[PDB]
Structure formats: structure tokens, C-alpha cells
Amino acid sequence: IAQQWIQSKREDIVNQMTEACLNQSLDALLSRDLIMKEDYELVSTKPTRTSKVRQLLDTTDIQGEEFAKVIVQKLKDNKQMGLQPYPEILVVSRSPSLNLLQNKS
Amino acid sequence: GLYSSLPPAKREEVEKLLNGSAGDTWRHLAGELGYQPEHIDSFTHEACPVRALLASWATQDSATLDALLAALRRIQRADLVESLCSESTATSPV
């Protein structure tokens, strides 16, 4: 859901997130241990405001819903009205994804 | 249910969907299971890093499926959980 949404409004998130929004999403990303210091410095070196958000979107390729929802959930605190239709946030309880069902014989 | 109770064919699908979605997936999971982001950075240099995390976690008592599915939520990667809930049905005779 958020993995699809980040590819629907990719051109809106970069225009909505000025620069202070990126710094706040970055602190929140590291709180979930989803980004290593080795690549979290590569998003913080970018000398151009819009180019900062580019390296942030490059991590989303590996992350899927993680670096995606962080954007949708940051913009919620700033209530910019550009992206009111935000995606889901963690709706799984015990779906048939990892769960067992098979047995011997 | 425990992750050690799963059949070998299920564990293969989890490895395939990890390695076919990303290369840091297991690292994020490890961080929220009780490991550290900079500490896994040395673990990525191993010959079987994905298998070693699953093995070193399966030797613990918290190796339950309900906890594993919720541990993807911590990192914010419901994309792994939803991909597996939609990719449960795929096989052929060939």
C-alpha cells in the first residue's frame, strides 16, 4: 500500500518536503534501525535541497514501505494538504505470510 | 507457532523474497530483534549472513511467528509481510 503510494506521489513528496521535513524523517528512520550510518551520511552530504530528497528516495528501492511511510507520516505533522490521501500504516496482525500450515506426511 | 516448526520449502520462500526485495532486509529485522545497526555492518561480511541471523534468532525463545510478523512492522517494512501474504500460492510440475 505505501510501497505503491510512494510511486504514485513521488513528484509531490519532493515538492511538499522543503528541507526541515527531510531532517525530521531522517532522525525517525534511524530510530527503526532501517538505515546504517554508512549510507545515512550519503543523504546528509547532498549540497542541494531537492538533491537531499533524491538520495532519500534511492534507499526506498531496498526498503519498500519503510522509507516510503516515513515521508507520508512526516508530512502528517506539517498538514500541508497536498497529500491528505496517505497510505496504510501497519495493518497486519497474523496474515498467512510467514505462518505454518504443512506437516510431516 | 515457532519458526523452527516451518517446513524447508517455506524457509526457502522467505530467503528468496528477502534476497529478491533487498540486501539490507535482514539487517533492519536484526536491529529491532535486539541487535545494533553498526554491529550488523560486520555481520554482512559473513558467507551466510541471511542464514546466520535466522539461525542465531531460531536458537532463542522469541523465535515465534506472531513476533516475526510484528518485527517487520517495527522497521516499517509491511512490504515483506504483504508480499508473503500475496505470494503464498506459486508452484508448477516443471
UniProtKB/Swiss-Prot annotation, chain A:
Changing residue 18 to K: Impaired interaction with NOD2 and decreased homooligomerization and ability to transmit NOD2 signaling. It comes from the Eukaryota. Residues 1-90 form the CARD domain. There is a cross-link at residues 69, 104 (Glycyl lysine isopeptide (Lys-Gly) (interchain with G-Cter in ubiquitin)). Changing residue 36 to A/K: Decreased homooligomerization and ability to transmit NOD2 signaling. The modification Phosphotyrosine is found at residue 40. Changing residue 16 to K: Increased activation of NF-kappa-B. Detected in heart, brain, placenta, lung, peripheral blood leukocytes, spleen, kidney, testis, prostate, pancreas and lymph node. Interacts (via CARD domain) with NOD2 (via CARD domain). Interacts (via CARD domain) with NOD1 (via CARD domain). Homooligomer; following interaction with NOD1 or NOD2, homooligomerizes via its CARD domain and forms long filaments named RIPosomes. Found in a signaling complex consisting of at least ARHGEF2, NOD2 and RIPK2. Interacts with ARHGEF2; the interaction mediates tyrosine phosphorylation of RIPK2 by Src kinase CSK. Interacts with MAP3K4; this interaction sequesters RIPK2 from the NOD2 signaling pathway. Interacts with IKBKG/NEMO. Belongs to the protein kinase superfamily. TKL Ser/Thr protein kinase family. This is Receptor-interacting serine/threonine-protein kinase 2. The gene is RIPK2. The chain holds residues 435 to 539 of 540 of the full protein.
UniProtKB/Swiss-Prot annotation, chain B:
It is found in: Cell membrane; Cytoplasm; Perikaryon; Cell projection, Growth cone. Changing residue 79 to A: Decreased interaction with ARHGDIA. Residues 1-94 are cytoplasmic. It comes from the Eukaryota. Residues 11-88 form the Death domain. N- and O-glycosylated. O-linked glycans consist of Gal(1-3)GalNAc core elongated by 1 or 2 NeuNAc. The death domain mediates interaction with RANBP9. It also mediates interaction with ARHGDIA and RIPK2. The extracellular domain is responsible for interaction with NTRK1. Homodimer; disulfide-linked. Heterodimer with SORCS2. The extracellular domains of the heterodimer bind NGF. The cytoplasmic region of the heterodimer binds TRIO. NGF binding mediates dissociation of TRIO from the receptor complex. Interacts with RTN4R. Interacts with TRAF2, TRAF4, TRAF6, PTPN13 and RANBP9. Interacts through TRAF6 with SQSTM1 which bridges NGFR to NTRK1. Interacts with BEX1. Interacts with BEX3. Interacts with KIDINS220 and NTRK1. Can form a ternary complex with NTRK1 and KIDINS220 and this complex is affected by the expression levels of KIDINS220. Low affinity receptor which can bind to NGF, BDNF, NTF3, and NTF4. Forms a heterodimeric receptor with SORCS2 that binds the precursor forms of NGF, BDNF and NTF3 with high affinity, and has much lower affinity for mature NGF and BDNF. Plays an important role in differentiation and survival of specific neuronal populations during development. Can mediate cell survival as well as cell death of neural cells. Plays a role in the inactivation of RHOA. This is Tumor necrosis factor receptor superfamily member 16.
